[PDB]
């Protein structure tokens, strides 16, 4: 999955998340055309209660049916205030996408961090199943006092083996704009004079 965020000089905004699902999708290239096909079908529930590649489960509502869209976690987002775009953001990360956005929103709106720090901050993830398992990435692993405390509570901590999202965000402050690209990835942001 990947995400990008755009604001134009008229205050219009686009937040776009799109994907093949896993890296390089199904691995199938269309001969003669040169593009990869998705492996999005794994976002359906293949069997009730059996976890997919992201550890999430389902039953009837997300079972495979012809013509049906498979449940996603992608959450391209735009915050407005008083009718004006104030923040544009989104991220890849499968079942971690909306918990990662939630954390960034907390960091901006509750901890009042600068956008770059809000995006760079450690992020973790829990999703009921696997039971009492909190995931971290190697960019900002759970360590020291906090990790001992969580383990003492009975949590299992695991390095999920890939970075916890790749937030790409734009903040608008009156007429001024700022960008932030997650240090977990290779993103770039630019402000463009009118």
């Amino acid at each position: 999955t990947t995400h990008f965020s755009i604001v134009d000089k008229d205050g219009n905004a686009v937040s776009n998340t799109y994907t093949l699902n896993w890296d390089f999708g199904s691995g199938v290239v269309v001969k003669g055309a040169g593009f990869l096909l998705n492996d999005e079908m794994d976002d359906f529930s293949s069997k009730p209660g059996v976890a997919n590649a992201f550890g999430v489960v389902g039953s009837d509502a997300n079972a495979i049916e012809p013509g049906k869209r498979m449940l996603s976690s992608m959450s391209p987002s735009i915050v407005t205030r008083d009718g004006h775009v104030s923040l544009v953001l989104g991220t890849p990360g499968g079942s971690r996408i909306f918990t990662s956005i939630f954390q960034v929103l907390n960091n901006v709106y509750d901890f009042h961090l600068p956008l770059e720090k809000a995006v760079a901050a450690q992020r973790v993830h829990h999703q009921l199943l696997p039971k009492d398992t909190i995931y971290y990435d190697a960019y900002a692993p759970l360590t020291g006092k906090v990790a001992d405390e969580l383990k003492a509570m009975g949590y299992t901590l695991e390095d999920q083996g890939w970075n916890m999202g790749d937030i790409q965000a734009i903040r608008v402050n009156g007429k001024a704009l700022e960008t932030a690209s997650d240090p977990r990835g290779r993103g770039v942001g630019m402000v463009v004079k009118p």
């Binding site: 999708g25 709106y109 973790v124 199943l129």
Partner: protein
């Protein structure tokens, strides 16, 4: 009338193209379309024309949402990934042609541009065609992901035929994809869903035992939907509705966190208590996610009930600020009980 425009893109090429389109007079949607085609060349692990996605927009003071998520092929069946013992077949839903949903990205980008774009469709494909014809420099993470993909795929797909030559720092060219994008620039989505590209995709299915047919491609439609709206602290968050779980999840995450404000006061970011509290909220979000959510035209999903403030307040009460809740006892919140 802002100080300018801005882009945050997942690589340097998407960012450059967005910036150029904005500078050339395109609006945010023009820039988004050009960026999305660029990343289908420079970010092949995720940027794509063979997958799908979602776009949230705010245009002239109004929110929009475009769903270009893949759909199951018409020949798909409930038990298609299970073997004769009813067990999941390893990687059948992840590797190879049967793992593919019908791609939506070309149709989604078309619809966004048809509705809001100021520049010509063909203009917006020229940058991506250029990176396909003359190349882009492979990133470190890309080489690592490719190394993993060669192992998982080889020798089950033709991945190595096309991406085996990726090497970090080296210019990677994609001549067949450039021709595909030229056809899309010239013919529009008809190329992908009805024309030369469709025929190549179908040929690939037939070769690999895939399910996607001409009927599947011709019936694909992107869908404009009303975005999920979440109000808190004088802000309004617009985000993805069904078939994304994220909008309902964010409604519940934000709503519940606000209900438990007293438990978050004085707690430092990413302390153990902070993380424990987030996990306690997430337990409930994922209990509802697994039980209720899916394509909204295929079941009667109780969206309003899962996002009503009285329901959010009930679920907020379940959070245990002091110890881990019994996983076994966290239930879908609308479940009848004694």
């Amino acid at each position: 009338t802002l100080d300018g425009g801005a882009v945050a893109a997942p690589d340097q090429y998407g960012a450059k193209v967005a910036a150029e389109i904005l500078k050339k007079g395109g609006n945010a949607v023009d820039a988004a379309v050009a960026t999305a085609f660029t990343l289908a060349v420079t970010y092949p692990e995720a940027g794509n024309i063979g997958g799908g996605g979602f776009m949230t927009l705010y245009v002239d003071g109004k929110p929009y949402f475009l769903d270009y998520r893949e759909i199951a092929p018409k020949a798909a069946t409930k038990t298609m990934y299970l073997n004769e013992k009813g067990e999941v077949i390893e990687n059948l839903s992840l590797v190879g042609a049967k793992a593919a949903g019908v791609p939506g990205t070309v149709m989604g980008l078309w619809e966004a541009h048809q509705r809001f774009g100021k520049l010509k469709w063909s203009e917006l494909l020229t940058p991506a065609i250029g990176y396909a014809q003359t190349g882009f420099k492979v990133a470190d993470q890309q080489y690592q992901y490719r190394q993993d993909a060669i192992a998982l795929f080889n020798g089950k797909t033709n991945f190595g035929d096309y991406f085996g030559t990726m090497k970090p720092g080296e210019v990677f060219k994609q001549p067949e994809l450039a021709k595909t994008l030229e056809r899309i620039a010239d013919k529009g989505p008809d190329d992908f869903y009805k024309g030369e590209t469709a025929k190549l995709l179908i040929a690939q299915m037939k070769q690999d035992g895939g399910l996607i047919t001409s009927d599947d491609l011709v019936d694909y439609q992107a869908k404009w939907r009303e975005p999920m709206r979440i109000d808190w602290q004088g802000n309004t968050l617009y985000t993805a509705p069904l078939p994304s779980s994220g909008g309902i999840a964010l409604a519940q995450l934000i709503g519940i966190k606000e209900q438990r404000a007293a438990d978050f006061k004085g707690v430092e970011l990413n302390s153990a208590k902070y993380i424990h509290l987030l996990s306690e909220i997430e337990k409930r979000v994922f209990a509802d996610r697994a039980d209720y959510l899916g394509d909204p035209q295929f079941s009667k999903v109780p969206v309003a009930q899962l996002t009503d403030p009285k329901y959010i307040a009930k679920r907020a009460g379940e959070v245990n600020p002091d110890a881990i809740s019994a996983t076994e006892k966290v239930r879908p919140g609308l479940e009848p009980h004694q």
